[PDB]
Paper text:
To understand how Spt6 tSH2 preferentially recognizes the Rpb1 linker peptide containing pS1493, we determined a crystal structure of Spt6 tSH2 in complex with Rpb11476-1500 pS1493. The crystals contained one complex in the asymmetric unit. Spt6 residues T1250-R1451 and Rpb1 residues L1479-S1498 were visible in the electron density map. The structure shows the peptide draping over the tSH2 domain in an extended conformation that buries 1,194 Å2 of solvent-accessible surface area with both hydrophobic and polar contacts contributing to the interaction. All of the contacts involve the cSH2 module, and are distant from both the vestigial pY-binding site in the cSH2 module and the canonical pY-binding site of the nSH2 module. The pS1493-binding pocket is formed primarily by Spt6 residues K1355, K1435, and Y1381, with the phosphate moiety forming hydrogen bonding interactions with all three of these side chains. K1435 and Y1381 are strictly conserved among Spt6 homologs, which suggests that the binding geometry is conserved throughout eukaryotes. Rpb1 residues L1479 to F1492 lie against the tSH2 domain in an extended conformation to bury a total of 923 Å2 of solvent-accessible surface area and eight hydrogen bonding interactions. In particular, the side chains of F1492, L1490, and L1484 are buried in a deep hydrophobic groove on the surface of Spt6 tSH2. Mutating either one (Spt6K1435A) or both (Spt6K1355A,K1435A) of the primary phosphate contacts in the binding pocket reduced the affinity for Fl-Rpb11476-1511 pS1493 approximately 100-fold (KD 8.3 μM and 25 μM respectively).
Residue numbers in the entry:
A (entry chain A): 1250 to 1451
B (entry chain B): 1479 to 1498
The structure:
Amino acid sequence: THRVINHPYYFPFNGRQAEDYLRSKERGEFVIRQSSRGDDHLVITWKLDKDLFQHIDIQELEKENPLALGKVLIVDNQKYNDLDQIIVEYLQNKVRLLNEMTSSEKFKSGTKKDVVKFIEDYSRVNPNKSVYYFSLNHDNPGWFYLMFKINANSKLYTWNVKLTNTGYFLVNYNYPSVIQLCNGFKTLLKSNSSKNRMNNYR
Amino acid sequence: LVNADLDVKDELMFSPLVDS
């Protein structure tokens, strides 16, 4: 059952204990633990925010025997050589990009419900403006909400932005920074809006 | 986690695009 892995961030934890362990640590801190999916998988559990953790599957290839750590590791469909490469090139960049998002003036802290309230209020006191903000999706670790209104009387739209190790995924493009995310969001909406106003009976 | 379709013809009035 239990599995040995020779590494300073490897702990003998299930998913829950990894979260309890991390509950006191800071954002970006993590553990590596065994997977419930067999001896060719591991998990990285890392802390995004208070009570907010993500569990990332690591797939092992090139295993010298059933219990050894694969000499090639797959995280999110990208190949890495060892756990340290994962920490530096995958995890650290995911943390970097999380901080870039939460430091953005377009990001609002709080619950989905809190941020819907703010955007609805802010839409009221600025009725001829299109408004959008990002916030944390607490029910899907690793995602942000992208909420917007066209004006005071439009309905409230919610879109979904996935954090990746190389940027922010919205619809079908991975934007490398928040600034480029906002610009692409706007450009995408203008593209949809222009389409919606076309004459298909031309 | 679906993205609701933009469905109206309301003119978009977003804040200006930003340089990088």
